[PDB]
Symmetry: D2
Subunit: 267 residues, 4 copies
Amino acid sequence: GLLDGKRILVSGIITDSSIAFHIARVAQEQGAQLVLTGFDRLRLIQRITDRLPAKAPLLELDVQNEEHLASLAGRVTEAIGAGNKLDGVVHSIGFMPQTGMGINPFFDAPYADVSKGIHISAYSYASMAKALLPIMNPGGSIVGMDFDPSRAMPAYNWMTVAKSALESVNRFVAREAGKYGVRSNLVAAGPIRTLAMSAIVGGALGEEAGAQIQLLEEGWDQRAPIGWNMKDATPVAKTVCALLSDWLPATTGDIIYADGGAHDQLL
Amino acid sequence: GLLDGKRILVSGIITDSSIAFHIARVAQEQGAQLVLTGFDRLRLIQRITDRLPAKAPLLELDVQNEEHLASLAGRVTEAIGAGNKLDGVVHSIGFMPQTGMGINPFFDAPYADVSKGIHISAYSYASMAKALLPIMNPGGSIVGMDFDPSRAMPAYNWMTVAKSALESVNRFVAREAGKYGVRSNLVAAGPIRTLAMSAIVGGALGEEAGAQIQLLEEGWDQRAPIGWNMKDATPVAKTVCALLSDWLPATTGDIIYADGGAHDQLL
Amino acid sequence: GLLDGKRILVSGIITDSSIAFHIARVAQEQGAQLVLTGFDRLRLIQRITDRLPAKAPLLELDVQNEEHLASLAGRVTEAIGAGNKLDGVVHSIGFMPQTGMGINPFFDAPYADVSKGIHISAYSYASMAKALLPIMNPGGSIVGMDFDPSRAMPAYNWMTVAKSALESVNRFVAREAGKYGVRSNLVAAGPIRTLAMSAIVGGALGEEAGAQIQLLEEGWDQRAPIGWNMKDATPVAKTVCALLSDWLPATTGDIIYADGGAHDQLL
Amino acid sequence: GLLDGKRILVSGIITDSSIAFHIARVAQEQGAQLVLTGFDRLRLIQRITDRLPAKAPLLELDVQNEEHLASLAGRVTEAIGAGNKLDGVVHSIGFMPQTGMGINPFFDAPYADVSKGIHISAYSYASMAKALLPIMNPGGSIVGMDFDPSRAMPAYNWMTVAKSALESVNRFVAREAGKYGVRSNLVAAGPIRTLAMSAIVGGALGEEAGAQIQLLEEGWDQRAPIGWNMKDATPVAKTVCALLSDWLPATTGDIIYADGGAHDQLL
Ligand SMILES: NC(=O)c1ccc[n+]([C@@H]2O[C@H](COP(=O)([O-])OP(=O)(O)OC[C@H]3O[C@@H](n4cnc5c(N)ncnc54)[C@H](O)[C@@H]3O)[C@@H](O)[C@H]2O)c1
Ligand SMILES: NC(=O)c1ccc[n+]([C@@H]2O[C@H](COP(=O)([O-])OP(=O)(O)OC[C@H]3O[C@@H](n4cnc5c(N)ncnc54)[C@H](O)[C@@H]3O)[C@@H](O)[C@H]2O)c1
Ligand SMILES: NC(=O)c1ccc[n+]([C@@H]2O[C@H](COP(=O)([O-])OP(=O)(O)OC[C@H]3O[C@@H](n4cnc5c(N)ncnc54)[C@H](O)[C@@H]3O)[C@@H](O)[C@H]2O)c1
Ligand SMILES: NC(=O)c1ccc[n+]([C@@H]2O[C@H](COP(=O)([O-])OP(=O)(O)OC[C@H]3O[C@@H](n4cnc5c(N)ncnc54)[C@H](O)[C@@H]3O)[C@@H](O)[C@H]2O)c1
């Protein structure tokens, strides 16, 4: 029971192939009591999360909605019971308008589109920490999902820029969270075949972008000394759970790579 | 004559202590023919640039203004003469609303403020490249100003996040500029006593932020094996000129540190 | 029981303040069956390890001794029983002759001294992997101890160089270990008050080196958003155990920072 | 005349395809007065350097020879004239025994071989700085040649480890050189078709190593936004000259990448 007795909020579930779905499942398998947040399609999300090993309250959260964020801590407290606080928070949220990715030229993404993507994908990590820190216990843990942006790559375009911003935000959140005895880290995962990504490989963002992303994935498994299985989010979910546990108690403002070791190898 | 015969656009002059003022002066000393761009206070900027060693046309450019950007290449061509192209572009532009810096808590910066700062400080590097690449010669060079954001620090807050985004943007601009035979790099400078920074040390953004920034500067000179003089922008200007020259012809998508070597030393 | 059922070799115990002593203790608390290796003073080491929660066989290993390394796998198999293999290996070994550290000038360390330090501190990580991989199970884990060498610092001198080499060796060991389904990682720890380090703060390597190291420690706790306690090796031991567990199964060739978050913060 | 009036020592010439040969040629084209050092085959080296644009004294230097190093400053002073000092030093020296590279397994390199390679390839950067700093002018520059070792790669094996050590040594040399008003930097170059490398592509170190290195080169040009020509050392030589000039006066303990931008791009 890695997370026995811990109360953990998990955002970012939209389908059963969501990385956050697997994070939630493994966390419950390890004894965590969950509260879920979902964006927009709550009926869908409730139906999806019915399949989790245990029941978990579902709260609505649009990270671009200031009213949602202002009320979030109160709604969470209602859900877990007055006198109880969170031990863990999982940020598994990301989005970039199509103009900011794929075959649409990098220079052709309008700032309003870029700004929306950075809002949801980077700023909201700070938004969620602001909302939830006042209801977190000492020794608590905030975790976000990263895709290694240290080098540029085809197709990912402005989403890669958004991840660069997220990594910087994480280091500042660590400074704030430290006052509460709370850690803040990112997990940089290898590529995972979510619905959206499958759609992209299938050409949803242009044939050229599809081809490059497919090449990107193949080179990843090739580089990874222990391989990489894009169809399996479990090793990622387990890593997130390691950061939510008491077993990395001196790590904060940092990035843990769950990518098969691909980023440490050139060829 | 390091830049003999080169035509170079320099943005970012606002006072005589602007880093871009020193970049422009050294470039002219080295034989460059300049075109300047300025934001908002053009009468002031013209009066300031009258002091440069040579005359240089001044064009208006608000990087948040789409009309300015759409017309920029045409206005530059008018200024340098049909048939002539730029060999160099200097981006020396940065801004973050006060809510995103200083003693104002990190979590209290409203996204609209953050988004404005990222627009001017990061996105606009791509905006300027889009506008100017069609009028740049092969072997050309685009340079932007960076402040090392790889670690978080007091007071700089969201401006540090904006610089993280800028570094990512630079790597993508390099991909685009490469098609034109053009390089794109950043110069990461140590802290420089511009008007704004002097104002901040003087408490303009809060006493606590002032104190931290003053401590930040002192530790910098201490760490730098060859020292660091915050009152002297010349070593920075020379580094920018090195990148505009033909002498780093295989460097692109990169960051050159002009910081006295401070970033490579821990204590 | 984080390590229930796992068989783990732990090197590097010399006193009760050794980092490896705490790694061994926490591992036993979590259900691991240990085999220990020790260098030179085996009577001392046996007497020290008598205090561990459980009994554990002690084998002699001088990593500079080719005969010791050639026989190591056989002696380990004898200790754990034919048919059984290791699930984990901890490398907690480091040394640099005094000429390579402290107030002795950097340029005055003779290569023979440097070479000895690099042999014990970096090459031996590969030596131990070569010896033990043939007797490790798939899903196994090799962990070594690192001190972040990405920036230079006073006093540590050639030991910092040795750590840079170690980090590079780790990435190559990951390539080799991957063929066995085995991971290889380093834990970069903050400074810990071992006997040797206390001796150094006390002036054993010169007053100037003592003063700098004491300053180094103070700045560390200051920078760490969750603080850093140099007198407590437990948070480091727990991190090593996390890497020996099944909970970071997609991380290899990497560095996990157990340093209070100090390395991600500038001031 | 980028280097007009400067006196510069250049090591590492062995054939006309040596990177140091091109560094020397470009430096002379830019007005530098050179002193050369060579290892072992001095008749060959003299005959090769006869082809440089200007005459230059050739001194013998085996960096593993303490007598050579002890006498080096005296011999250089003799060559350039009492009262004159060096403004620049180029370290272009590297070697690793065959057991430490290619298809020979990583684990099978004997430490004595590794230690020799690290001595010549990393330690000697410090050796040369120790010897020459006492005869360098303020504003002087020391430059060494690097091959980016931040990620592991096939075939390069222990030479990659040696480069990791070199990068760490450079940061410490910067600390020492700073007391003399002297800078120390590395140039990380893309792969260059020297004699040795051609031999390796041709299978001199095994067919598998040959194939991997050939693949390595192809991916490099592919990744580089401005391309990479392995048959042309000139862009590398020019970058080294930029660091020897007065145009990067605030850069020390650093690495400048002359690699076509390949290291900043993933695919
Ligand atoms: N799939 C990959 O290859 C991959 C790799 C590394 C990192 N990541 C990251 O993992 C995280 C989860 O992505 P995923 O791959 O599971 O995709 P996903 O589509 O399953 O999940 C993304 C989630 O973000 C939510 N979201 C979008 N806008 C929102 C808003 N305004 N307010 C609240 N929620 C909003 C969506 O509802 C969705 O649940 C993202 O940050 C993603 O960038 C993904
Ligand atoms: N001063 C430092 O310590 C320091 C250190 C490292 C990097 N930098 C960077 O150097 C660059 C120049 O800054 P500086 O220190 O010379 O300050 P500065 O105030 O002198 O110059 C900043 C410039 O940005 C311009 N600008 C703001 N909004 C604009 C817009 N909408 N459109 C066009 N221009 C706009 C301003 O007019 C001004 O000319 C900035 O990117 C800054 O972040 C500064
Ligand atoms: N103490 C710190 O501040 C600190 C910080 C980060 C990393 N580390 C690393 O942690 C590891 C353990 O160091 P420690 O601080 O526990 O010091 P320690 O003195 O307690 O342990 C070092 C061990 O290395 C062993 N050793 C030396 N030469 C050997 C050889 N020839 N063969 C086999 N073993 C040999 C010694 O016997 C000793 O047991 C080292 O790699 C050290 O660099 C220490
Ligand atoms: N060729 C490449 O792809 C490449 C890429 C990046 C960096 N580099 C580096 O550039 C530098 C020059 O290498 P190169 O490619 O020109 O190869 P090269 O063979 O032409 O030059 C290597 C030089 O090192 C010298 N040397 C070897 N042992 C010595 C010793 N004991 N004392 C003094 N000198 C000694 C040799 O005489 C030779 O002149 C090396 O550090 C190399 O690692 C090479």
